[PDB]
């Protein structure tokens, strides 16, 4: 059945853990496994204590995220519909134990420097179960990089990458991400000048501007294979739809409007909505190292503004990728 935490996180691996993110689900750490950076997502399951304001999920309720993470990871190795724009999934374990004190130390450091919205995970007993997902390390989130991007050309690249990856997942998996806020877009440096994707057998390239994008966090995502749908049913969630103070919170309500609160259905317009929210962040909340004070860069800005203005008239990421003038 379950294994002890030390199976997944031997002493040296625990000693190198640094906390990088969080959500109601639990905690995300970066560490090193076999000289390789990885990200570890740790989710409490099956217990009766409140955790970050929700009850813990059952093993059955975590399976959708596991399945989705695996399907999107596989897309990097496929042929007809191929993208590296999600993130690799290396392993999944069920572990048992109280939270390691070294992880608490990392948690404390994050709380001291960035602040946490979570409860300190120090109340779990030695019989507590967790799911531990180990992912390829994907870089730094777009929000944390909001003052670090070179120019609007870099912004165009990121939007193109995101759109393409979403299109390929729509094509292969009838995928909707459903929570693609700017914390869920990771950026990593690449020396590749061009990145490659294949959509329904047709391969294309995207200029990288030195960055490779990875879309993460499939907690709210939906997909299907052979008529079998995997999703998070939020039809009875109150709080998800009553956020304020950021366009992000409007996106939840707009998705609910689009799907009539039926979350099992396929509505790839949700991917469009998130891309619109991301484009909006690109135009309003980023500080580029190079301003748009040359005619060439101005032109890119006008193109992104045109995208912002027109993209909500498209039906899916696939429609955007294949038809929108931004990508031509
Ligand atoms: C970078 C940390 C991020 C900042 O907004 N927060 C979260 C929060 C939820 C979440 N679920 C999965 C991942 C996840 C999955 C794979 C990863 N590879 N490299 C980093 C990864 C993170 N996250 N990350
Ligand atoms: Na990736």
């Amino acid at each position: 059945g379950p294994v002890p935490f030390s199976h997944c996180l031997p002493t040296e691996k625990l000693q190198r853990c640094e906390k990088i993110g969080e959500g109601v689900f639990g905690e995300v750490f970066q560490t090193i496994a076999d000289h390789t950076p990885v990200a570890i997502k740790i989710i409490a399951i099956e217990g009766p204590d409140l955790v970050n304001g929700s009850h813990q999920k059952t093993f059955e309720e975590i399976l959708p995220e596991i399945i989705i993470s695996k399907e999107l990871s596989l897309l990097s190795g496929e042929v007809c519909n191929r993208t590296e724009g999600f993130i690799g999934l290396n392993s999944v374990h069920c572990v048992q134990g109280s939270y390691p004190p070294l992880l608490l130390k990392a948690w404390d450091h994050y709380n001291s420097t960035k602040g946490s919205a979570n409860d300190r995970p120090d109340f779990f007993k030695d019989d507590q179960l967790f799911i531990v997902l180990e992912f390829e390390f994907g870089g730094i989130d777009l929000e944390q990089m909001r003052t670090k991007l070179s120019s609007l050309a870099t912004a165009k690249s990121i939007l193109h990458q995101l759109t393409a990856s979403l299109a390929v997942a729509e094509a292969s998996l009838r995928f909707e991400h459903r929570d693609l806020h700017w914390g869920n877009v990771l950026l990593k440096k690449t020396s590749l000048k061009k990145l490659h994707y294949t959509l329904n057998g047709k391969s294309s390239t995207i200029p990288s501007c030195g960055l490779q994008v990875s879309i993460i966090d499939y907690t709210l995502s939906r997909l299907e294979r052979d008529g079998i749908v995997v999703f998070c049913d939020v039809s009875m969630d109150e709080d998800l739809f009553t956020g304020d103070g950021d366009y992000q919170f409007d996106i939840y309500r707009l998705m609910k409007k689009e799907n009539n609160n039926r979350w099992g259905e396929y509505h790839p317009y949700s991917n469009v909505l998130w891309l619109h929210y991301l484009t909006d962040k690109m135009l309003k909340q980023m500080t580029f190292k190079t301003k748009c004070n040359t005619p060439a860069m101005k032109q890119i800005k006008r193109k992104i503004q045109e995208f912002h203005r027109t993209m909500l008239n498209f039906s899916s990421a696939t429609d955007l990728l294949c038809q929108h003038s931004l990508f031509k």
Side-chain angles (χ1 to χ4, degrees):
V3 303
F5 256 105
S6 59
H7 195 264
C8 290
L9 290 167
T11 312
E12 191 205 310
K13 198 162 166 185
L14 273 177
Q15 291 177 309
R16 292 167 176 283
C17 280
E18 295 178 348
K19 176 174 166 176
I20 61 174
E22 64 171 42
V24 166
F25 62 80
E27 308 292 339
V28 187
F29 300 86
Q30 185 184 344
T31 191
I32 296 295
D34 285 314
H35 299 355
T36 305
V38 294
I40 298 300
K41 182 170 187 177
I42 306 178
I43 304 172
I45 57 164
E46 299 284 347
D49 305 319
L50 288 165
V51 177
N52 306 325
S54 291
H55 287 296
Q56 298 169 36
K57 295 190 173 314
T58 59
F59 175 63
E60 292 79 6
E61 289 164 334
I62 294 305
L63 270 166
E65 179 176 358
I66 297 164
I67 291 167
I68 297 177
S69 304
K70 179 55 177 310
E71 291 299 324
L72 294 175
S73 178
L74 288 168
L75 290 179
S76 70
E78 290 290 358
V79 175
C80 304
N81 282 302
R82 194 192 81 88
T83 179
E84 297 177 17
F86 296 94
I87 195 63
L89 175 65
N90 295 339
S91 67
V92 182
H93 295 88
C94 180
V95 302
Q96 183 169 57
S98 49
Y99 223 72
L102 285 161
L103 290 189
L104 294 171
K105 166 178 212 290
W107 192 96
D108 285 343
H109 182 77
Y110 183 100
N111 184 54
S112 283
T113 52
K114 302 197 179 161
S116 185
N118 281 0
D119 299 300
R120 188 173 188 267
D122 56 20
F123 53 89
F124 292 122
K125 308 307 186 156
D126 63 357
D127 72 333
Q128 183 64 49
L129 302 180
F130 303 81
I131 297 294
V132 173
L133 301 90
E134 178 182 293
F135 294 97
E136 180 189 17
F137 178 62
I140 304 298
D141 62 90
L142 181 58
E143 174 171 31
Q144 294 303 136
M145 293 290 283
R146 74 187 180 279
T147 68
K148 305 296 198 170
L149 305 185
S150 177
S151 73
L152 283 166
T154 314
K156 185 174 164 197
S157 181
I158 291 164
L159 289 169
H160 196 167
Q161 293 185 52
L162 287 166
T163 304
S165 296
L166 294 169
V168 167
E170 285 171 358
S172 181
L173 299 160
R174 290 164 63 92
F175 175 72
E176 299 168 53
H177 185 284
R178 295 181 176 182
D179 197 19
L180 199 34
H181 62 80
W182 61 343
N184 286 342
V185 176
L186 309 184
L187 307 175
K188 184 185 268 213
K189 289 201 210 181
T190 180
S191 57
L192 296 167
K193 292 178 178 179
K194 299 192 304 199
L195 302 173
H196 294 268
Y197 71 92
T198 307
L199 179 69
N200 295 318
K202 181 167 181 179
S203 288
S204 287
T205 60
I206 304 173
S208 64
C209 292
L211 292 177
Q212 161 80 229
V213 179
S214 296
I215 293 167
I216 60 152
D217 189 4
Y218 320 128
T219 303
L220 289 190
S221 308
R222 172 263 192 234
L223 61 68
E224 66 179 273
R225 291 194 63 176
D226 293 303
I228 304 300
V229 184
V230 178
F231 71 109
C232 186
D233 185 3
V234 295
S235 54
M236 308 299 139
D237 199 306
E238 286 153 279
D239 292 352
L240 190 52
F241 306 106
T242 56
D244 196 25
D246 185 317
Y247 187 42
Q248 177 182 345
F249 298 110
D250 299 316
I251 302 301
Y252 303 125
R253 292 184 276 275
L254 290 167
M255 282 190 296
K256 183 181 174 152
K257 179 149 171 297
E258 165 65 18
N259 64 29
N260 295 289
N261 207 31
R262 292 192 287 264
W263 299 83
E265 298 178 357
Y266 180 47
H267 291 269
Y269 190 69
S270 71
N271 295 322
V272 177
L273 289 166
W274 288 102
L275 288 168
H276 187 253
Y277 150 93
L278 290 161
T279 300
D280 186 78
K281 290 280 179 280
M282 288 303 189
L283 291 169
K284 293 176 171 144
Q285 288 175 245
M286 317 273 163
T287 308
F288 302 103
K289 300 261 178 56
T290 302
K291 310 312 176 191
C292 72
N293 301 333
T294 65
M297 205 64 68
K298 258 160 260 158
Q299 172 66 18
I300 293 172
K301 189 173 194 184
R302 278 190 305 269
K303 288 289 204 190
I304 297 170
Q305 284 170 333
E306 171 162 30
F307 193 61
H308 188 267
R309 179 178 83 243
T310 55
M311 64 193 298
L312 290 177
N313 291 327
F314 289 67
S315 66
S316 63
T318 305
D319 183 23
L320 287 169
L321 183 73
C322 296
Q323 309 217 74
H324 201 289
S325 67
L326 185 56
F327 308 121
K328 289 177 193 319

mmCIF file of all heavy atoms in Angstrom, residues 2 19 38 71 89 110 117 148 170 193 222 232 246 287 314 320 327:
data_model
loop_
_atom_site.group_PDB
_atom_site.id
_atom_site.type_symbol
_atom_site.label_atom_id
_atom_site.label_comp_id
_atom_site.label_asym_id
_atom_site.label_seq_id
_atom_site.Cartn_x
_atom_site.Cartn_y
_atom_site.Cartn_z
ATOM 1 N N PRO A 2 0.579 2.198 0.927
ATOM 2 C CA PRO A 2 1.430 3.409 0.912
ATOM 3 C C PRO A 2 2.881 3.143 1.326
ATOM 4 O O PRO A 2 3.151 2.200 2.051
ATOM 5 C CB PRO A 2 0.759 4.302 1.939
ATOM 6 C CG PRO A 2 0.230 3.351 2.935
ATOM 7 C CD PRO A 2 -0.259 2.147 2.124
ATOM 8 N N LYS A 19 10.461 25.550 -1.094
ATOM 9 C CA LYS A 19 9.063 25.647 -1.506
ATOM 10 C C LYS A 19 8.934 26.686 -2.628
ATOM 11 O O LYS A 19 9.532 27.749 -2.522
ATOM 12 C CB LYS A 19 8.167 26.053 -0.342
ATOM 13 C CG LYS A 19 6.723 26.274 -0.717
ATOM 14 C CD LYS A 19 5.816 26.539 0.453
ATOM 15 C CE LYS A 19 4.491 27.082 -0.070
ATOM 16 N NZ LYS A 19 3.507 27.281 1.003
ATOM 17 N N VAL A 38 13.653 18.839 -10.060
ATOM 18 C CA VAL A 38 12.291 18.379 -10.141
ATOM 19 C C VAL A 38 11.395 19.229 -9.252
ATOM 20 O O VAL A 38 11.896 19.919 -8.368
ATOM 21 C CB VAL A 38 12.104 16.906 -9.703
ATOM 22 C CG1 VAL A 38 12.832 16.014 -10.706
ATOM 23 C CG2 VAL A 38 12.610 16.694 -8.313
ATOM 24 N N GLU A 71 -1.612 12.252 -19.194
ATOM 25 C CA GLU A 71 -1.967 12.446 -20.611
ATOM 26 C C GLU A 71 -1.231 13.633 -21.262
ATOM 27 O O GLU A 71 -0.816 13.537 -22.392
ATOM 28 C CB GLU A 71 -3.488 12.628 -20.791
ATOM 29 C CG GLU A 71 -4.333 11.393 -20.529
ATOM 30 C CD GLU A 71 -3.998 10.230 -21.465
ATOM 31 O OE1 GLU A 71 -3.690 10.414 -22.660
ATOM 32 O OE2 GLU A 71 -3.993 9.066 -20.987
ATOM 33 N N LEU A 89 5.621 14.438 -16.251
ATOM 34 C CA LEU A 89 5.272 13.785 -15.012
ATOM 35 C C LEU A 89 6.200 12.592 -14.860
ATOM 36 O O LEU A 89 6.247 11.663 -15.748
ATOM 37 C CB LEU A 89 3.838 13.289 -15.026
ATOM 38 C CG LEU A 89 3.412 12.470 -13.802
ATOM 39 C CD1 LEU A 89 3.422 13.314 -12.555
ATOM 40 C CD2 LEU A 89 2.010 11.895 -13.994
ATOM 41 N N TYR A 110 9.436 30.063 2.919
ATOM 42 C CA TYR A 110 8.518 30.658 1.974
ATOM 43 C C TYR A 110 7.531 31.626 2.689
ATOM 44 O O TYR A 110 7.262 32.724 2.182
ATOM 45 C CB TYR A 110 7.726 29.622 1.285
ATOM 46 C CG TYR A 110 6.778 30.042 0.217
ATOM 47 C CD1 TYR A 110 7.117 29.923 -1.142
ATOM 48 C CD2 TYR A 110 5.466 30.471 0.529
ATOM 49 C CE1 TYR A 110 6.230 30.261 -2.149
ATOM 50 C CE2 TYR A 110 4.559 30.795 -0.470
ATOM 51 C CZ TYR A 110 4.936 30.724 -1.809
ATOM 52 O OH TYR A 110 3.992 31.026 -2.799
ATOM 53 N N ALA A 117 -0.912 31.658 2.013
ATOM 54 C CA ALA A 117 -2.369 31.615 2.330
ATOM 55 C C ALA A 117 -2.785 30.263 2.944
ATOM 56 O O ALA A 117 -3.988 30.032 3.211
ATOM 57 C CB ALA A 117 -3.151 31.854 1.063
ATOM 58 N N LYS A 148 10.667 40.832 -15.922
ATOM 59 C CA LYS A 148 11.909 40.226 -16.357
ATOM 60 C C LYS A 148 11.946 39.928 -17.848
ATOM 61 O O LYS A 148 12.988 39.593 -18.333
ATOM 62 C CB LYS A 148 12.113 38.889 -15.605
ATOM 63 C CG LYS A 148 12.058 38.996 -14.086
ATOM 64 C CD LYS A 148 13.169 39.842 -13.544
ATOM 65 C CE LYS A 148 13.369 39.582 -12.063
ATOM 66 N NZ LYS A 148 14.621 40.265 -11.638
ATOM 67 N N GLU A 170 -6.472 20.248 -27.297
ATOM 68 C CA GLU A 170 -7.861 20.234 -27.793
ATOM 69 C C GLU A 170 -8.010 19.146 -28.828
ATOM 70 O O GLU A 170 -8.962 18.376 -28.793
ATOM 71 C CB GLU A 170 -8.278 21.591 -28.382
ATOM 72 C CG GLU A 170 -8.552 22.688 -27.364
ATOM 73 C CD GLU A 170 -8.740 24.050 -28.018
ATOM 74 O OE1 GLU A 170 -8.614 24.121 -29.271
ATOM 75 O OE2 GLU A 170 -9.093 25.037 -27.320
ATOM 76 N N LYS A 193 16.371 28.264 -31.051
ATOM 77 C CA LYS A 193 15.801 29.454 -31.701
ATOM 78 C C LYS A 193 14.331 29.250 -32.058
ATOM 79 O O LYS A 193 13.553 30.233 -32.085
ATOM 80 C CB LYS A 193 16.597 29.856 -32.947
ATOM 81 C CG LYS A 193 17.975 30.373 -32.564
ATOM 82 C CD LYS A 193 18.797 30.720 -33.778
ATOM 83 C CE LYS A 193 20.137 31.285 -33.354
ATOM 84 N NZ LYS A 193 20.912 31.588 -34.582
ATOM 85 N N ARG A 222 -10.091 19.381 -17.648
ATOM 86 C CA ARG A 222 -11.038 18.415 -18.206
ATOM 87 C C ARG A 222 -10.451 17.858 -19.522
ATOM 88 O O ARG A 222 -9.864 18.604 -20.318
ATOM 89 C CB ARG A 222 -12.358 19.119 -18.488
ATOM 90 C CG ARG A 222 -13.405 18.324 -19.233
ATOM 91 C CD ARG A 222 -13.465 18.585 -20.744
ATOM 92 N NE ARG A 222 -14.689 17.984 -21.239
ATOM 93 C CZ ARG A 222 -14.807 17.105 -22.245
ATOM 94 N NH1 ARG A 222 -13.793 16.859 -23.051
ATOM 95 N NH2 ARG A 222 -15.946 16.545 -22.469
ATOM 96 N N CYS A 232 -13.007 18.004 -13.142
ATOM 97 C CA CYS A 232 -13.373 18.457 -11.788
ATOM 98 C C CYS A 232 -14.748 19.120 -11.770
ATOM 99 O O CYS A 232 -14.997 20.179 -12.386
ATOM 100 C CB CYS A 232 -12.313 19.416 -11.312
ATOM 101 S SG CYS A 232 -12.580 19.880 -9.595
ATOM 102 N N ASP A 246 -9.444 41.035 -9.759
ATOM 103 C CA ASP A 246 -8.572 40.636 -10.863
ATOM 104 C C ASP A 246 -9.497 40.022 -11.902
ATOM 105 O O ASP A 246 -10.468 39.300 -11.583
ATOM 106 C CB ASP A 246 -7.545 39.624 -10.334
ATOM 107 C CG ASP A 246 -6.452 39.180 -11.377
ATOM 108 O OD1 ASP A 246 -6.697 38.902 -12.548
ATOM 109 O OD2 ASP A 246 -5.314 38.954 -10.939
ATOM 110 N N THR A 287 6.365 44.600 -17.225
ATOM 111 C CA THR A 287 7.390 45.631 -17.473
ATOM 112 C C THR A 287 8.506 45.025 -18.319
ATOM 113 O O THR A 287 9.235 44.141 -17.846
ATOM 114 C CB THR A 287 8.011 46.143 -16.154
ATOM 115 O OG1 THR A 287 6.976 46.540 -15.241
ATOM 116 C CG2 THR A 287 8.963 47.304 -16.418
ATOM 117 N N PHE A 314 -13.396 33.925 -31.307
ATOM 118 C CA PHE A 314 -12.916 32.639 -31.777
ATOM 119 C C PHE A 314 -13.439 31.543 -30.836
ATOM 120 O O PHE A 314 -13.690 31.807 -29.666
ATOM 121 C CB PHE A 314 -11.389 32.613 -31.830
ATOM 122 C CG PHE A 314 -10.807 33.456 -32.935
ATOM 123 C CD1 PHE A 314 -10.927 34.813 -32.920
ATOM 124 C CD2 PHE A 314 -10.124 32.870 -33.971
ATOM 125 C CE1 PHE A 314 -10.415 35.576 -33.956
ATOM 126 C CE2 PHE A 314 -9.600 33.599 -34.995
ATOM 127 C CZ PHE A 314 -9.765 34.966 -34.999
ATOM 128 N N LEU A 320 -7.956 29.891 -32.916
ATOM 129 C CA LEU A 320 -7.010 30.987 -32.818
ATOM 130 C C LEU A 320 -5.716 30.685 -33.541
ATOM 131 O O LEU A 320 -5.185 31.523 -34.302
ATOM 132 C CB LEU A 320 -6.715 31.349 -31.355
ATOM 133 C CG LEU A 320 -7.785 32.071 -30.539
ATOM 134 C CD1 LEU A 320 -7.350 32.062 -29.087
ATOM 135 C CD2 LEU A 320 -7.967 33.507 -30.978
ATOM 136 N N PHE A 327 -0.680 35.021 -35.639
ATOM 137 C CA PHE A 327 0.235 33.893 -35.883
ATOM 138 C C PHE A 327 0.647 33.696 -37.331
ATOM 139 O O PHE A 327 1.416 32.787 -37.636
ATOM 140 C CB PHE A 327 -0.376 32.638 -35.305
ATOM 141 C CG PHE A 327 -0.792 32.802 -33.878
ATOM 142 C CD1 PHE A 327 -2.107 32.600 -33.520
ATOM 143 C CD2 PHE A 327 0.116 33.233 -32.903
ATOM 144 C CE1 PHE A 327 -2.512 32.734 -32.213
ATOM 145 C CE2 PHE A 327 -0.278 33.425 -31.587
ATOM 146 C CZ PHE A 327 -1.617 33.170 -31.244
#
